[PDB]
């Protein structure tokens, strides 16, 4: 009951910042996450014994893939923590509870392949879920782990609070399907620019939580350049594997996923920052002003990719 998780001084300080890297010590990530829940939500949102057993089951159900791994899960959860801490009063007791869990769980049991690859390979998951294939599977894995004995961290909620939190987590996880991001952001642009945007409108909150999830999910583009650059390796290692598997199915993969076209990476980062990242953190900063650091870091790293092309690194 009186057991405050504390971190070494540098982490204690650095963790509050958007650009925090959680480090190479796997065995500290669970304590980083519990620390984040306690400061975000309260020391009493969750029975500690249930929380810990949930975290270790979630961890076990992430695979040893180069990017879509347990490190990713905790990285996206920490970005959500930074957003929630710099916007204290805008979110309910339940949204704070559900969104960190949503982020930790958001890529559960990912195999390192796009929804696109499942559809062309004709994976059973693509017959069970026609759109947002992996994302419906991720949510489905969350519920499975929540129903393991001694793993219901939401046990103390009412019947209707429990249903509310599982619906926050479902929409939060579906929103990480980047196919849905584009429309979601355009609608948020329009609504904020005409003044229609209203945070008491539940369907408007949903869109804003949706955009936060894209932002946290893409947060590797908002790090110090050496972190961004080294994560890009892990990211491309999956794409090139998936490209290999597309070729095995007798299909030329998009150049992004083609490991013969490594030369084109810097320009592909350009495309991505201009088409996806900058628009994402631009619209997010308009809706949620204290998140500007994400936009500024994203801009700084775009500038760093421009420099790679110009042969200045
Ligand atoms: C975080 C991040 N995500 C991507 C990404 N995708 C998002 C998921 C599907 C495509 C594409 C590219 Cl080219 N870079 N990139 C980065 C840096
Ligand atoms: Mg995903
Ligand atoms: Zn993700």
Ranges of each domain in the chain: 28-310
**Cβ–ligand 1 contact at 278 (below 6 Å):** no
Cα separation, 124 vs 109, whole angstroms: 15
- Residue 76: both structure tokens together: 């996206």
Cα distances (Å, whole numbers) of residue 33 to 27, 54, 253, 282 = 11, 12, 37, 27
Residue 44: exposure state from Cβ atoms within 10 A (0-12, 13-18, ≥19)? exposed
Termini Cα distance of the chain: 52
Q: Which fold has domain 28-310?
A: Catalytic domain of cyclic nucleotide phosphodiesterase 4b2b (1.10.1300)
CA of residue 313 to ligand 2 center, whole Å: 30
Q: Looking at the CA of 74, name the nearest ligand.
A: 3
Cα separation, 136 vs 89, whole angstroms: 30
Q: Which atom of ligand 1 is nearest to the CA of 218?
A: 1
In degrees rounded to 5, what are phi and psi of residue 298? -60, -55
Cα separation, 220 vs 115, whole angstroms: 21
DSSP assignment of 99-167: HHHHHHHTTTT--S--HHHHHHHT-HHHHH-SSSHHHHHHHHHHHHHHTSTT--TTTTS-HHHHHHHHH
Q: Are 94 and 164 in contact (CB under 8 A)?
A: yes
**Cβ–ligand 1 contact at 178 (below 6 Å):** yes
**Cβ–ligand 1 contact at 221 (below 6 Å):** yes
Nearest CA to ligand 1 atom 1: 218
Which residue from 92, 100, 91, 22 is spatially nearest to 54, judged by alpha carbons? 100
Nearest CA to ligand 1 atom 6: 272
Read off the DSSP letter of residue 175. T
Q: Are 242 and 134 in contact (CB under 8 A)?
A: no
178-194 helix and 202-217 helix, angle to the nearest 10 degrees: 130
Mention every residue, 6+ apart, whose C-beta is less than 8 A from residue 66.
112, 234, 235, 237, 238, 241
- Residue 185: both structure tokens together: 């952001």
Cα distances (Å, whole numbers) of residue 47 to 1, 124, 298 = 9, 36, 37
72 is in an annotated binding site: yes
Three-state DSSP class for residue 250: coil
- Residue 151: both structure tokens together: 């793993």
Which approach determined this entry? X-ray
Cα separation, 75 vs 69, whole angstroms: 10
Cα separation, 145 vs 151, whole angstroms: 7
């Amino acid at each position: 009951g009186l057991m405050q998780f504390t971190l070494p001084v540098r982490l204690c300080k650095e963790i509050e910042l958007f650009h925090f890297d959680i480090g190479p010590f796997e065995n500290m990530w669970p304590g980083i996450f519990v620390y984040m829940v306690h400061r975000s939500c309260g020391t009493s949102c969750f029975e500690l014994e249930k929380l810990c057993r949930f975290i270790m089951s979630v961890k076990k159900n992430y695979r040893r893939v180069p990017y879509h791994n347990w490190k990713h899960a905790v990285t996206v959860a920490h970005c959500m923590y930074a957003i929630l801490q710099n916007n204290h009063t805008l979110f309910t007791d339940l949204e704070r509870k559900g969104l960190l869990i949503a982020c930790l769980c958001h890529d559960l049991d990912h195999r390192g392949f796009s929804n696109s690859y499942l559809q062309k390979f004709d994976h059973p998951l693509a017959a069970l879920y026609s759109t947002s294939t992996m994302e419906q599977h991720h949510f489905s894995q969350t519920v499975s782990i929540l129903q393991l004995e001694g793993h219901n961290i939401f046990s103390t909620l009412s019947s209707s609070e429990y249903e509310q939190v599982l619906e926050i987590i479902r929409k939060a996880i579906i929103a990480t399907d980047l196919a849905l991001y584009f429309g979601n952001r355009k609608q948020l642009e329009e609504m904020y620019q005409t003044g229609s945007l209203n945070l008491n409108n539940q369907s408007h909150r949903d869109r804003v939580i949706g955009l936060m999830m894209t932002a946290c999910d893409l947060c590797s583009v908002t790090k110090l350049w050496p972190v961004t650059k080294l994560t890009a390796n892990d990211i491309y290692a999956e794409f090139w594997a998936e490209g290999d598997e597309m070729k095995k199915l007798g299909i030329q993969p998009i150049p992004m996923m083609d490991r013969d076209k490594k030369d084109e990476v810097p320009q592909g980062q350009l495309g991505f920052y201009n088409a996806v990242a900058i628009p994402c953190y631009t619209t997010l900063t308009q809706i949620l002003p204290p998140t500007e650091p994400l936009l500024k870091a994203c801009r700084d790293n775009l500038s760093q990719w421009e420099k790679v092309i110009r042969g200045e690194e």
